[PDB]
Amino acid sequence: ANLRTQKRLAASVIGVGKRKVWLDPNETTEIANANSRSAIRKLYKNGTIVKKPETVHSRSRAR
Amino acid sequence: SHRKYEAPRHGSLGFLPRKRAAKQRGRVKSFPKDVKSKPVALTAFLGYKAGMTTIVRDLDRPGSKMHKREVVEAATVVDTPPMVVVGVVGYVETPRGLRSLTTVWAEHLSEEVRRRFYKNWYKSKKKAFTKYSGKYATDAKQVETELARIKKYASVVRVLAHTQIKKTPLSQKKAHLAEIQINGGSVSDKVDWAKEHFEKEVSVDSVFEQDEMIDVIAVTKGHGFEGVTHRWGTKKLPRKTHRGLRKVACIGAWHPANVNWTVARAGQNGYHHRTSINHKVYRVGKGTDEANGATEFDRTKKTINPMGGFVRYGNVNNDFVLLKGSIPGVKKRVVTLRKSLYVDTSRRAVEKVNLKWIDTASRFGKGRFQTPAEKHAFMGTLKKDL
Amino acid sequence: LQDVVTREYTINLHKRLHGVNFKKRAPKAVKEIKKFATLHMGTTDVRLDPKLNIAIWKRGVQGVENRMRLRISRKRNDEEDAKEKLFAYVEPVIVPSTKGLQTVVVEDD
Amino acid sequence: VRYAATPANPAKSASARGSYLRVSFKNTRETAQAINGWKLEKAQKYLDQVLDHQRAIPFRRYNSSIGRTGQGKEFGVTKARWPAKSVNFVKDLLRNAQANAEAKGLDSSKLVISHIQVNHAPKQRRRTYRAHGRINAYQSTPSHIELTLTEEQIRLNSRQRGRLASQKRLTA
RNA sequence: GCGAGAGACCGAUAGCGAACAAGUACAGUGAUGGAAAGAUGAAAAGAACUUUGAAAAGAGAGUGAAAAAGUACGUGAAAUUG
RNA sequence: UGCUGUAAAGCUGGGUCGAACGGCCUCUAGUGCAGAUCUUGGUGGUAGUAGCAAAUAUUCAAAUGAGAACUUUGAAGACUGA
RNA sequence: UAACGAGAUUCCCACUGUCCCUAUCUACUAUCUAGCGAAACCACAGCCAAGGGAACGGGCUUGGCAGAAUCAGCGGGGAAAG
Ligand SMILES: [Mg+2]
Ligand SMILES: [Mg+2]
Ligand SMILES: [Mg+2]
Ligand SMILES: [Mg+2]
Ligand SMILES: [Mg+2]
Ligand SMILES: [Mg+2]
Ligand SMILES: [Mg+2]
Ligand SMILES: [Mg+2]
Ligand SMILES: [Mg+2]
Ligand SMILES: [Mg+2]
Ligand SMILES: [Mg+2]
Ligand SMILES: [Mg+2]
Ligand SMILES: [Mg+2]
Ligand SMILES: [Mg+2]
Ligand SMILES: [Mg+2]
Ligand SMILES: [Mg+2]
Ligand SMILES: [Mg+2]
Ligand SMILES: [Mg+2]
Ligand SMILES: [Mg+2]
Ligand SMILES: [Mg+2]
Ligand SMILES: [Mg+2]
Ligand SMILES: [Mg+2]
Ligand SMILES: [Mg+2]
Ligand SMILES: [Mg+2]
Ligand SMILES: [Mg+2]
Ligand SMILES: [Mg+2]
Ligand SMILES: [Mg+2]
Ligand SMILES: [Mg+2]
Ligand SMILES: [Mg+2]
Ligand SMILES: [Mg+2]
Ligand SMILES: [Mg+2]
Ligand SMILES: [Mg+2]
Ligand SMILES: [Mg+2]
Ligand SMILES: [Mg+2]
Ligand SMILES: [Mg+2]
Ligand SMILES: [Mg+2]
Ligand SMILES: [Mg+2]
Ligand SMILES: [Mg+2]
Ligand SMILES: [Mg+2]
């Protein structure tokens, strides 16, 4: 119900910013139990936590 | 100390207080003075302000530099379907002023005038004038008794007439009911005229002729709360004045230690009752005429309506009055047209108007055609025309 | 009278947003659409599909389309206490053009 | 605890209290006076319509420089408001006193608000910061609320007697 | 300073600044400055239990000589207020 | 609730309250308040009033919860723009 | 006295709402609501005219008059406040 810690942990485990962390909205209970970085790694590996793709800055017009 | 320099006062003290009119229907404060030798006739009519147009006219004013030369003039269209006579009121001369003695009504009143007597018509049993309608039971001697009382005691007779607002494009269903004084003939003649016209329509052509000078009674355009600068036309203060400049700098001397009634103050602007006089009748149009806007020089079979209709009014499908210039009120306003209170023999009042041409281009933009036929002739075939 | 009904409407969002603060045009299109569903379905409980919110905001805070074709469904409220016996569900209709389209009853099949 | 007014028949009455309630006293006085003497069911329906802005609470004493509304015409005023926090606190106490009346066996369709009054509670102080390094008060004006639901010869002179006696003898 | 006995002294805005975790809390860079604040009841017997409420609470009940003593506690004035 | 006195005041009925207090002959004084921009404490009208307006901007849904403009998550729209 | 100057001054070109003479538009206020909620000030208060008067009255004298409760504005008076 308050996944503020899990998103902060996921950013550090994945290595991206918090703006790139996706917490499965249908797995709130499972994520809320992920109190450790070890549990965050498992959810990242399972696809419960996803690293969102980088927003594209194309250099085509500059080229 | 005195003013350093003299200037006239801003605004008129004869139009105070600058408050909202008590009613939206302008009321005839004074009717034309009654002359017995004249025939029995109405002195006023109710209409609706449709819009403004333009005409072309040859001026007949000897000694003018525009004499026998075309002038382009602004005109106002007043939609005036015939009014229905439904009642008559008798007034008695008393040392305290006129006093209404009796009001006699017609047997049948249309629904549009019976809606006048309701705030919530749709929730009502619509019981108005039903017992009165029963008063006409098989001899109608109560009505004749009241009419005889009017004949015996009344000195001023006014008819009760309502507009046929269903013939206008307005969505309002309440008719406008007003008292219109009857002038001419004896009191008995007036009462007989009123009785014989019960439930009958009276047209504008029976009240106003062309080239007449008439007065317009209306409530002007509302502007809401307004500051002194535009309400009273006072001078704006310099650009560098602290706390603002659309003010009157001095609203009074130290003494009288009060604010005077003659000082301009912010308040409600517009929506005032005005009586505007000496508007010349250029045209009393007929609703049945399919060439309302046609003249003797412009034979285009053409109604008075501009292309696309009058903006925010609609089309004038009724009889209408075409007045020179501007009259108070807004579009859709109920307008009271009153006969002149004096005899004007000046050349401006007695000139005979013959119209050359009436503008019927669109008022919704820079219209450049007078007719859809003209538009098609100018542009030719379009894609939507196939 | 059928309490459960689905119809497709065109809403003229252009005239409803006329003169509106530019940073309130997409927020007000949400309110105008809710008020639109109350007018037609008679229910003050109006729920917007999140795909409709995406379509409203697709061109930013003031890029709201002139016309949107909407599907509005009146459905029975099963909650207790609902305090509203029915509710209206509004969701977008993807059409080539939003012009010339009249109100149509959708028979859910 | 002692109520301001004791019921005439305590067996046909139920009471409720709320003390140190952090709701505007002035708003709560007006909403309490708006339902004083009403049927309980009529006041409950009325307070629901106030929360929905279908009807208003007339402000009669604490109304200086507040807005005007057409929803005050029902009560012959122009100044009326819809104080939601006060209505909710009062609805809670009407609900409580009705529960107290049900536990006594009273009939809710017969209940009437026979007594309701609002008193000042001790103020709650805060601080506001002013120009030129000044501190001012930012107090709350809380309320005490209480309510009660109640189920629905001539001696004459010698000559006065003499006149009276002699008048009887005239009437046979 | 230590140890005692007293008074036509003051009685909690008085008497020492301090009757209380008072040179305390708190302020000031610093030297220094420096409060407010006593009283349920003989005894917590400080309200078990039921009920309404999300809760705080309320209503019943209970203890007590008294709850017109419920710790927001003896009495409970005035301003001010319902 | 009244009575007495020109008065300063004294006495008394009812209510509240809970531990001391008064009359008379004298003694004594830190002995009488409407004011001092008096002191300390408390309370009003003002007044539900002034106001809560810089820093582009929020919206839909689900979850949680008695209760969600404001919490969490998702979707979007934005900004800071090294 | 060349150069320099947010120094003071006069004239000219350009420019313009500084002005003739104002009008229109935008955002934020003001406004109305829910929540929150101060302060200055306050002998008592608050309609005028004349008189006399500490010689410029809200109160006194003589007149005019005078009908609940009020909202937005306003800056004549309160010889307004500080
Ligand atoms: Mg304006
Ligand atoms: Mg300046
Ligand atoms: Mg001026
Ligand atoms: Mg035009
Ligand atoms: Mg606009
Ligand atoms: Mg008041
Ligand atoms: Mg205001
Ligand atoms: Mg107001
Ligand atoms: Mg001692
Ligand atoms: Mg002390
Ligand atoms: Mg001390
Ligand atoms: Mg004490
Ligand atoms: Mg419970
Ligand atoms: Mg006792
Ligand atoms: Mg006690
Ligand atoms: Mg006590
Ligand atoms: Mg008192
Ligand atoms: Mg006694
Ligand atoms: Mg005693
Ligand atoms: Mg004792
Ligand atoms: Mg003694
Ligand atoms: Mg002394
Ligand atoms: Mg004193
Ligand atoms: Mg003080
Ligand atoms: Mg105060
Ligand atoms: Mg305000
Ligand atoms: Mg501000
Ligand atoms: Mg979010
Ligand atoms: Mg940017
Ligand atoms: Mg030099
Ligand atoms: Mg220089
Ligand atoms: Mg320099
Ligand atoms: Mg203001
Ligand atoms: Mg004098
Ligand atoms: Mg005077
Ligand atoms: Mg004075
Ligand atoms: Mg007098
Ligand atoms: Mg002033
Ligand atoms: Mg001002």
Contact C48, C27 (CB under 8 A): no
Q: Is D116 helix (H, G, I), strand (E, B) or coil?
A: strand
Provide the CA D116 to C1' E75 distance, Å, integer.
29
| Strand E and D2 CB separated by under 7 Å | yes
Chains touching chain C through at least 3 C-beta pairs below 8 angstroms are: none
Contact A32, A53 (CB under 8 A): no
Partners of B99 in the beta sheet?
B92
Question: β-strands C86-92, C46-48: how paired?
Answer: parallel
For residue D121, which of D58, D30, D28 has the smallest C-alpha distance?
D28
The Cα-based distances of B368 to A40, B170, B217, B362, B372 in angstroms read 75, 28, 34, 8, 11
Reading the block at residue B23, the tokens are 């009613």
Cα D144 to ligand 14 centroid, rounded to whole Å: 25
Q: Taking the CA of residue B353 as centre, how many other CA atoms within 13 Å lie in the half-sphere pointing to its CB?
A: 25
- How does C4-38 read in b/e, with b if 16+ C-beta sit within 10 Å? ebbebbbbebeebbeebeeeebbebbbebbbebbe
Nearest-angstrom CA–CA distance, D117 and B106 = 59
Cα D67 to ligand 27 centroid, rounded to whole Å: 21
Q: What's the CA angle centered on D139, arms D138 and D142, to 5 degrees? A: 150
Taken as a whole, chain A contains a residue count of 63
Cα D114 to ligand 18 centroid, rounded to whole Å: 33
- How does B194-205 read in b/e, with b if 16+ C-beta sit within 10 Å? bbebbeeebbbe
Assign 3-class secondary structure to B121-141.
CCCCCCCCCHHHHHCCCCCCH
Q: What is the DSSP letter of B371?
A: S
Q: Which nucleotides of E are covered by protein (CB under 7 A)?
A: 51-53, 55-60, 67-68, 72, 81-82
Assign 3-class secondary structure to D118-165.
EEECCCECCEEEECCCEEEECCECCEEEEEEEEECCCCCCHHHHHHHH
- How does B295-334 read in b/e, with b if 16+ C-beta sit within 10 Å? beebeeebbbbbbebbeebbbbbbbbbbbbeebbbeebbb
Provide the CA B262 to C1' G76 distance, Å, integer.
12
| Strand F and A3 CB separated by under 7 Å | yes
- The region, left, alpha or beta by phi > 0 then psi within -120 to 50, assigned to residue C60 is left
Contact B76, B49 (CB under 8 A): yes
| Strand F and C95 CB separated by under 7 Å | no
User: At residue D148, what are phi and psi to the nearest 5 degrees?
Assistant: -130, 130
Q: What is the DSSP letter of B240?
A: T
Nearest-angstrom CA–CA distance, C93 and C52 = 9
Burial of B76 (0-12, 13-18, 19+ CB in 10 A): buried
| Strand E and D61 CB separated by under 7 Å | yes
Query: Nearest nucleotide, C1' to the C-alpha of D93?
Result: E58
* Number of C-beta neighbours around residue B35 at 10 A: 9
Nearest-angstrom CA–CA distance, B108 and B132 = 9
| Strand E and D50 CB separated by under 7 Å | no
User: Which residue's entry shows tokens 């307070």?
Assistant: D47
Nearest-angstrom CA–CA distance, B15 and B22 = 15
Q: Which nucleotides of G are covered by protein (CB under 7 A)?
A: 17-24, 26-28, 31-39, 47-49, 56, 58, 69-78
The Cα-based distances of B250 to B230, B257, B263, C22, C25 in angstroms read 17, 13, 9, 41, 45
Nearest-angstrom CA–CA distance, B136 and B131 = 9
For B338, the enclosing helix (H) or strand (E) is strand B334-339
Question: β-strands B97-105, B213-219: how paired?
Answer: unpaired
User: Determination technique for this PDB entry?
Assistant: cryo-EM
Cα B243 to ligand 33 centroid, rounded to whole Å: 14
Query: Nearest nucleotide, C1' to the C-alpha of D120?
Result: E81
* Number of C-beta neighbours around residue B22 at 10 A: 9
Nearest-angstrom CA–CA distance, B147 and B140 = 11
| Strand F and D117 CB separated by under 7 Å | no
For B152, the enclosing helix (H) or strand (E) is helix B141-153
Ligand nearest to the CA of D59: 6
Cα B252 to ligand 37 centroid, rounded to whole Å: 27
Cα B266 to ligand 3 centroid, rounded to whole Å: 12
User: Which residue's entry shows tokens 């009634």?
Assistant: B261
Cα B248 to ligand 22 centroid, rounded to whole Å: 62
Reading the block at residue D164, the tokens are 């009276």
Angle between helices A37-46 and A4-14 (to 10 degrees): 70
Handedness of CA C58, C62, C66, C70 (dihedral sign): positive
Contact A13, A40 (CB under 8 A): yes
User: Which residue's entry shows tokens 């007989």?
Assistant: B192
C38-C42-C48-C54 Cα dihedral, nearest 10 degrees:
-40
Reading the block at residue B64, the tokens are 């003018």
Q: Which protein residue has its CA closest to C1' of F56? A: C23
Chains touching chain A through at least 3 C-beta pairs below 8 angstroms are: none
Provide the CA D61 to C1' G43 distance, Å, integer.
26
Q: What's the CA angle centered on B28, arms B26 and B34, to 5 degrees? A: 165
- The region, left, alpha or beta by phi > 0 then psi within -120 to 50, assigned to residue B310 is beta
Could you list the beta-strand ranges (E) of B119-198: 156-162, 177-183
* Number of C-beta neighbours around residue A9 at 10 A: 22
B273-B278-B283-B285 Cα dihedral, nearest 10 degrees:
30
Nearest-angstrom CA–CA distance, D79 and D57 = 9
Question: β-strands B41-42, B177-183: how paired?
Answer: antiparallel
Nearest-angstrom CA–CA distance, B109 and B161 = 11
Query: Nearest nucleotide, C1' to the C-alpha of D62?
Result: F48
Question: β-strands B201-202, B83-94: how paired?
Answer: antiparallel
Question: β-strands B213-219, B177-183: how paired?
Answer: unpaired
Contact B82, B202 (CB under 8 A): yes
Provide the CA B242 to C1' G7 distance, Å, integer.
28
Q: What is the DSSP letter of D108?
A: G
Contact C109, C87 (CB under 8 A): no
Provide the CA D62 to C1' G39 distance, Å, integer.
19
Provide the CA D127 to C1' G38 distance, Å, integer.
9
The Cα-based distances of B48 to B114, B327, D157 in angstroms read 20, 11, 84
Q: Which nucleotides of F are covered by protein (CB under 7 A)?
A: 43-44, 46-50, 56-64, 71-78
For residue B176, which of B311, B48, B361, B366 has the smallest C-alpha distance?
B48
| Strand F and C50 CB separated by under 7 Å | yes
| Strand F and C90 CB separated by under 7 Å | no
Nearest-angstrom CA–CA distance, D170 and D166 = 7
User: At residue C10, what are phi and psi to the nearest 5 degrees?
Assistant: -100, 125
* Number of C-beta neighbours around residue B367 at 10 A: 15
Query: Nearest nucleotide, C1' to the C-alpha of D118?
Result: E82
Contact A30, A60 (CB under 8 A): no
| Strand F and D136 CB separated by under 7 Å | no
User: At residue A59, what are phi and psi to the nearest 5 degrees?
Assistant: -95, 15
B184-B214-B204-B71 Cα dihedral, nearest 10 degrees:
140
Distance of CA B106 to the CA centre of its chain: 25
Q: Which protein residue has its CA closest to C1' of G75? A: B251
Provide the CA A27 to C1' F63 distance, Å, integer.
10
Cα C49 to ligand 26 centroid, rounded to whole Å: 38
Nearest-angstrom CA–CA distance, B294 and B291 = 5
Handedness of CA C3, C9, C13, C15 (dihedral sign): negative
Nearest-angstrom CA–CA distance, B329 and B216 = 10
The radius of gyration computed from the CA coordinates of chain B, to the nearest angstrom, equals 25
- The region, left, alpha or beta by phi > 0 then psi within -120 to 50, assigned to residue B63 is left
Cα D61 to ligand 6 centroid, rounded to whole Å: 4
Contact B309, B315 (CB under 8 A): yes
| Strand F and A4 CB separated by under 7 Å | yes
Q: What is the DSSP letter of B314?
A: B
Reading the block at residue B378, the tokens are 């100018």
Taken as a whole, chain B contains a residue count of 386
Query: Nearest nucleotide, C1' to the C-alpha of C21?
Result: G27
| Strand F and C21 CB separated by under 7 Å | no
Nearest-angstrom CA–CA distance, B45 and B288 = 19
Cα B226 to ligand 1 centroid, rounded to whole Å: 7
What is the C-alpha end-to-end distance of chain D, expressed in Å?
69
Ligand nearest to the CA of D65: 8
Provide the CA C87 to C1' E19 distance, Å, integer.
72
For C38, the enclosing helix (H) or strand (E) is helix C25-41
Reading the block at residue B203, the tokens are 């047209």
The Cα-based distances of C41 to C29, C30, C52 in angstroms read 18, 16, 18
Handedness of CA C53, C59, C63, C67 (dihedral sign): negative
Nearest-angstrom CA–CA distance, B314 and B326 = 19
Provide the CA A22 to C1' F74 distance, Å, integer.
8
Q: Is B99 helix (H, G, I), strand (E, B) or coil?
A: strand
Chain D residues 86-115, Cβ below 7 A from strand E: 92, 95-97, 99-100, 103-104
Q: Is C34 helix (H, G, I), strand (E, B) or coil?
A: helix
Contact C90, C52 (CB under 8 A): yes
Contact B181, B156 (CB under 8 A): yes
| Strand F and C57 CB separated by under 7 Å | yes
Query: Nearest nucleotide, C1' to the C-alpha of C23?
Result: F57
Taken as a whole, chain D contains a residue count of 172
Reading the block at residue D56, the tokens are 């208003």
What is the C-alpha end-to-end distance of chain A, expressed in Å?
47
Nearest-angstrom CA–CA distance, B294 and B306 = 12
For residue B155, which of B41, B38, B33 has the smallest C-alpha distance?
B33
Contact B180, B43 (CB under 8 A): yes
| Strand F and D13 CB separated by under 7 Å | no
- How does B93-118 read in b/e, with b if 16+ C-beta sit within 10 Å? eeeeeeeebbebbbeebeebbbbbee
Angle between helices D25-34 and D84-103 (to 10 degrees): 50
| Strand F and A50 CB separated by under 7 Å | no
